[PDB]
């Protein structure tokens, strides 16, 4: 079938260089035009440009001029992007795509993050019920994630257990750190004679935690 | 550049409804135009080609129809899963370029959310900071004010708001919200709060707790 695979996450310098991968397989590479689309947070999507792998040919959006440069290697089937001169505004996922009018194969994009900041592992902690509006049926226990770099970390509870009444809210940035909350809800009748556990993992910094909601008897 | 506007914005819709999504281009671009859609977080997936045609796979559900400067696509029966990002693109000429987005949202039955409050942790704390975290869960609308208050007294500096996509399962939201402060800054108050208004209720949900009570 035609694939169309793009190379991993990237966290990027200001300043810096980026070279984005597309691999293509399945069909003659040489033939199609490769197509570059960058999607920054909600904002609509941006024709980059493209290019012909078999000739060398290559059209740039003019607003793209001298930032995208667009090669290929014909032998191992692979286009590339080039960003040059990274800002925090190049900060986006791109998408490599099969030239054809329409596009009906799209690489499952690439995400790039500029910043100066760097791997910190993350605060993971624990909030247990006030005092005071615990009491109910159910109970809503929270994990608080905080100051991590970069994206992601990875929040389960009881170790995949609970799966049932868990959300995870999308990071925020707060001071060029990432903050996150998770919370899950459970019958008053597992917490707190239940052990419920946090799970943290964030494989930037090769942590892991496991942070248990201890009731606030303290 | 041909300019592809796409109306409305935001779609609320209750599945069953047939809706009709339109994308005008700033000049003719002929019948070089195909619509896309994006779930959260996933490549695009093209459902028309040329105006109208059809590719394998895509529900029967979806057609285009159009031609030079008005484009639609019509889904009859908006079904659960038909939520996300409908875009157009041109084809026409160089660059090539794409619509602003039509977001769909399914409609669903009003839903309170339910406020929860928690005091800033002691191990966060020691280190000197003070997070305080409002979940505001399974809500819709989408609308909703949150408002935090410390001695009675509101404060607007130092929330950071996150919400989660519309739910796949229930179609509700989620929401929370957090308060940092200094621990110093903290500790030179008693009553903090978390007070939501939403549209199922007159009166707000308010949450509160007492920074000493144990």
């Known amino acids: 079938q035609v694939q169309l695979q793009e190379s991993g996450a990237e966290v990027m310098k200001p300043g810096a260089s980026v070279k984005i991968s597309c691999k293509a397989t399945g069909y003659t590479f040489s033939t199609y035009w490769i197509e570059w689309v960058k999607q920054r947070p909600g904002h609509g999507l941006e024709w980059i440009g493209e290019?012909?792998?078999?000739?060398?040919?290559?059209y740039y959006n003019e607003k793209f001029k001298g930032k995208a440069t667009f090669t290929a290697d014909t032998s191992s089937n692979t286009a590339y992007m080039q960003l040059s001169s990274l800002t925090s505004e190049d900060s986006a996922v791109y998408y490599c795509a099969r030239g054809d009018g329409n596009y009906g194969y799209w690489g499952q994009g690439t995400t790039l993050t500029v910043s100066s900041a760097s791997t910190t592992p993350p605060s993971v902690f624990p909030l247990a019920p006030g005092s005071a509006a615990q009491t109910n049926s159910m109970v809503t226990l929270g994990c608080l994630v905080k100051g991590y770099f970069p994206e992601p970390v990875t929040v389960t509870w009881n170790s995949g257990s609970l799966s049932s009444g868990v959300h995870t809210f999308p990071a925020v940035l707060q001071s060029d750190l990432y903050t996150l909350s998770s919370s899950v809800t459970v019958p008053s009748s597992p917490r707190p004679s239940e052990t419920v556990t946090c799970n943290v993992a964030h494989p930037a910094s090769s942590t892991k935690v496991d942070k248990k909601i201890v009731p606030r008897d303290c | 550049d041909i300019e592809l506007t796409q109306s409305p914005a935001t779609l609320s819709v209750t599945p069953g409804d047939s809706v009709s999504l339109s994308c005008r281009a700033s000049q003719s671009i002929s019948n070089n135009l195909h619509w896309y859609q994006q779930k959260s977080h996933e490549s695009p997936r093209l459902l028309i080609k040329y105006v109208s045609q059809s590719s394998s796979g895509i529900p029967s559900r979806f057609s285009g129809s159009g031609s030079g400067t008005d484009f639609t696509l019509s889904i009859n029966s908006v079904e659960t899963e038909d939520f996300g990002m409908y875009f157009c693109q041109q084809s026409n000429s160089w660059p090539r370029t794409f619509g602003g987005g039509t977001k769909l949202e399914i409609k669903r039955a009003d839903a309170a959310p339910t406020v929860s409050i928690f005091p800033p942790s002691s191990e966060q704390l020691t280190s000197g900071g003070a997070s305080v975290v409002c979940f505001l869960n399974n809500f819709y609308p989408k609308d909703i004010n949150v408002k935090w208050k410390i001695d009675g007294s509101e404060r607007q500096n130092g929330v950071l708001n996150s919400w989660t996509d519309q739910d796949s399962k229930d179609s509700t939201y989620s929401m929370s919200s957090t308060l940092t402060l200094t621990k110093d800054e903290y500790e030179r108050h008693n009553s903090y709060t978390c007070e939501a208004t939403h549209k199922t209720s007159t009166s707000p949900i308010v949450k509160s707790f007492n920074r000493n009570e144990c």
């Open positions: 290019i012909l792998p078999g000739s060398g040919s290559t």
